[model samples]
Target: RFNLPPGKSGWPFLGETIGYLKPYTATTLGDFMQQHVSKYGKIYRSNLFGEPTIVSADAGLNRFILQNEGRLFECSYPRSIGGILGKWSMLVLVGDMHRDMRSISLNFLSHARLRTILLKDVERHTLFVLDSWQQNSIFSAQDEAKKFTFNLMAKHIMSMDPGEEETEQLKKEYVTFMKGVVSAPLNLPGTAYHKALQSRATILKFIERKMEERKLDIKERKQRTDDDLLGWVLKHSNLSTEQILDLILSLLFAGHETSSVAIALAIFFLQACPKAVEELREEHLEIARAKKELGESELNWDDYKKMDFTQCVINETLRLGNVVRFLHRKALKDVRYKGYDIPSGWKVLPVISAVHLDNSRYDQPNLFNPWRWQQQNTWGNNYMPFGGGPRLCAGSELAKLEMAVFIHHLVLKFNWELAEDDKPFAFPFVDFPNGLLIRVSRIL
Candidate 1:
């Protein structure tokens, strides 16, 4: 009586979950996706996460799904994801609740805040990483990249200073938490997932302590509430303490992980593309030369925007690297598009990475070519590294600013090459095997 998209539902209740989740390189679609996409075209049907799913590798359907938002599709990540980020998380929330939290985060990460506060902080952190580098030393580029972003988020989110006893301890906890975020939730005592739950508890309790401390700072000592994320949320928003706690933890996870992946991948990608490195160095070097003459020791908003080539490099890196591979959404009602039927309540996996690497949409989709982005606006649905629609990444500009600043500092300060074969893999989570080992030549 009705049409479902082409594909088979593997196994019984297990479905094709194991097959669909087979780990592969970020640069190419996995055997599961490649085989399926070729067999059934871009839009295909399969059971995933224990549900009949319509996996979309098509830009038009992806665009339709994302833009349609609450009207058609509802945010539906795996239960394992929500177990850590919390049900209250904007990533898991729906309709009004999601909108409410999204607005708050967007406000905190506004361009106004970026210019006045984030720009300098990002630059300072960029320098911290570059300054720590030793000439002829093999640096764990991946670890450093992760640390740089996590350190920055720790400061901005709650003013935790890097390398301090408190911060270092929390870093250990967060690393454990991150491990859990990617792992299957068996909850066995020795498991990473179990430890991650403990880590989350430890973190939230610390956040609560900070909340009390900040209250004393604000009410008794007249400390400014606009100082950090927690401070601002406490002073401005009326979210419950539970909601607020989840908010901070979720925001921390979001800021720490995604930006770090983008950064590490950029460092890796630039290693192979010498032309990009030279072009990028040329762009950032000019900015440094001009800024030094201006009696300014810092990169300003104008100079930040001038890193147009850097943005292209980042775009190219994210496109090829596929930092954010796909997004989770489920159909709210039976929907058909261009003769495709999406049954009501079926899962929709909008694989953004698939479209980014699609041969029909991009030329030489596997190669690193920053200049490709200079031709036109390749954004909209086909080019969303930060996802799309109302749920578009609020921290997107912050991520870009982080990349631009880090790239500027790194390109100007050093030249580096892979110390080993530490390539990125998707155990469905993006990670490097040997932490992206690289040897550096401090040339600046």
Candidate 2:
């Protein structure tokens, strides 16, 4: 029999949970993992979230786990998260079902579709938000970014322009739902998990009503001309209503949260690096000048492609900010790697953020250096902001485009100063508790 990976399991049942959570209280998830790696090597055994777990910080091993998505390991999350995401959610699917759902989603979020139909909306909304910012002396970058990303996704997914009242209501419920994703699995009244379940019900009812409206429109041959994602799914997908609702939920969560956090961090990083900001501005201005010469008022796929430096900036921000702290997978069978065994049914945590800051992989791993990307490819196995393999985030390209679009308008029209020296915490999710406060002024 193969030996289990070397590491402590801490206290039974609640093994390592407090030790793991203690670091997060001080905003040092990477530090916690690093401490463990120092003691037990790259792959080690521990218990987390009430399960016997293997935490892997080895780059080669992380890639292997990600690549073997269904055969050797499968996506896994805590009970509270599964409850909130629902059984039909794509985030929990496996094997052929996962592949099929992913294919369907890609058809809608594909590059050609985004370029032809969604690029204009991204630019339009970005400009609208930026213009509104000029009227305010100060605004929370995180707050505004969330609004922009949420509205953009809402428009694309449902073709609905929910005004302030409806948008705020949805945001409130969504935040509640997010809080429950990583909470204790307690289902009693007044618990975070309880509120999450309630919010899910409210959100689902809203989506169900919209789906019904779309069905009626299809039946009457009165569907909207835009043909948003909801309309496409109604016409093409063979999925049940519940499955469709799960998909919509997954898309909205993935699309908005990651992109908004990226935009907010980009602003923060740019404010701290004036030379990077200047270079970014020059790149956007060059595009603008060419567009003026060509008499074009809108950004094209070609324009998005030409933003090389801006792409670097976004990539660097993703590296340092580390939106996804880790990916959860469970072993399907006893597996041997090197001299250790990962037993079947045990949770495997790929510490992605730890890998991102690995000194061996990245020189000055903690620094904000966009130019490092120019020296070598950042899409290598070790550098995965969007994870890897068959289970890679479907919205990766769209997320990049959204960031580029927002950055383009932002650099050309406005400059912002940080209103407070706010720091980010990585546990549960990447967030700034005080919000990323910034004062906006027109670029004169």
Candidate 3:
């Protein structure tokens, strides 16, 4: 009923997957998309991730696809990732189920809840992590950021702390799980996907044990005393143990990876742009001064809300870092956009990084300029690091809060510089080749 987009499907079964994966493996995902757009225009049909995929860089169509989830498009992911994340995971759910799960997650992570109970914990852990980093002359920014985020998730999501043996064990397993999230679906022994599945089983078993313990506690006491995320979910939702575990795993994976990369990239950008760092530091120092004047030892939600410049820094980092490089959706029906047809069942890939790097959408798209946010009324339709529409990241506010708190302490307490030349790989996941090593010096 509609005209298909122009492009090649490549070899049978394999399609253009090799071409699709080449840039990512080389850490140049943006450049690859740029080349594709030049050759095939903004909308092109390419076989990727073992599907006849329609890849779009057209801002208008991308926005439409995201905004029309379920009606015209539904979330899609690699088969390996879907199997690993599980069917109950919110990321793969659609329609009413996804909406219900999102509501449940949001109930715990909402701004009001964070203000009353979570911000203090976030700030405490952030300050503690920064202080620990100060104890060492050099540290990997990415590694510390992951540790900080993991600990924060553990504390809030499971009421667990950093050094607890169970928490440490879970963290190690999660690292293995992450490595397999984007790996090929080969199920052979020793493959990343296989290892991921193994680690996932281990992680799930631990969570299941915790859930059983909590159930017993609830049965004995009738309610949980802890104010952590797990407690809230158990008390609020009627989700099965499997569902709860899946949700928690999704949260842990999404929350930690995205926020950690964002923080690390923000640090990289800040170090490179001294003027932005100066302004950012000034903003936080002023807040610190005000809190000191008020005799307040901790930052509150109001304090975080006022950090507009810090938000700018975060936005810019998200833009350039392209934490979520692309969004995948399966066409539920034949959809026509700008004279091209997205055939039913085909994967619709919205190239997020392409939109973020579009010269028309951003001034000097390659430059690290936090101040550019001030010139725009909104982040624009193309700027979607947390995604857009009905399925926009439920933990977006929480992620931003965590980053703001981390930056607050990072800029206030210590100065840091890169320990070695490091490059970030944008595809699959945003990561530093050398873990973003940085040397730190305490500020008087």
Candidate 4:
């Protein structure tokens, strides 16, 4: 047997179960990684419920793993998320099918398409949420941003504009499901995971009819807009209903869940660094004012292109929050790098938190600094918030723009502060803030 790397040992079969209980609570995993990395160097292995897994923060190691998708490694987005979404979902698909589905998704969320249609939806929905905020009174910014991203994603991707009532219901259901997925796999009738699985079924059924309609509509028109990822998938492929459902489910779950968490973190970080927040606020207002001067009150692609500061903010948030905390890989056959033997079937987790915090790559590695991304050295082989190589997130452009527009409008329309005592937090599982609260004052 290959000797595993070093780390903590928790209860047997229930390995690290208690640690996973509140995975979304801030600093839990970061603290753990800090402890492990101190002892293990850049690479080490730990067990979660008797399953041996390798966790590495080594930059050179990350470069190898992230760049080796398809040939050496593949998309295995952890077993926990796969179960909640369903077995057939795209996140689990390997080989040619994964490549094809990812390509189709990329087309729908391409830069040109997102700017034209999705940006409008993001702008419209985010501003509507911003309008409801009351200055100096703390609101759950994460909850609000989650709703905005959900609606934005639905309108642009699924063609479903969930009304307020449906939106509220969906939010509750999503939380229930997320809780269960991270919990122990006990499928008893009333367990969180059990309830989550039930809710997952409800959501799937609810989206099925809508997907069927989309299929029919695409056939009738023989053309599809970049707006609908489902439409793009249908246009390009001859997929069965199950395959389509899986792909769509993957998009919905991965699309907003991670991005929403990142958005909330952006707000939290910006609030803490008032200089960055003030600069961002002014930059957005200048853009808005520029659009007004051009006799176009509504921002379009041209105006959006000019917002470098917005892009910087998004990159910085991704750098600091790193919502997608770890990239997982498993060895297909034996391989060796840096004198470490990676035996077949051994699980590899690239601990992104370490890479993001590497002092060599980022100055003041722990600081919330947007200007770092603006510096010439920021875009390199190391800074990968969306993973790297072939399996890098297909929706990167859309995620970036969606977040940029949301923040731009959010700051332009309101002044925000962390709800007093909201405390900087992070969920160990996802590595993002918990219950980000912001008090908003309308810029009248």
- Which prediction has the highest TM-score against the true structure? 1
> What TM-score does each of the candidates earn?
0.97, 0.95, 0.95, 0.89
- Could you tell me the TM-score of candidate 3? 0.95
Error at 368, model 4, angstroms = 1.2
Worst 10 residues of 4 by lDDT: 20-29
Angstrom error at residue 150, model 4? 0.8
Candidate 1 has its poorest 10 consecutive residues by lDDT at 181-190
Clashes of 1: 0
Model 1 vs. true fold: TM: 0.97
Best by lDDT: 1
For candidate 3, write residues 115-154 as lDDT tens digits.
8777988888897787676534677889889888888888
The lDDT values for all models are 0.86, 0.82, 0.80, 0.71
Q: Which model is ahead, 3 or 4, in terms of TM-score? A: 3
Pairwise lDDT winner, candidates 1 and 3: 1
Off by over 4 Å in 4: 1-29, 164-169, 182-190, 216-227, 430-434
lDDT digits (tens) for residues 202-247 of candidate 1: 8989989988888777787575567689988888889888898899
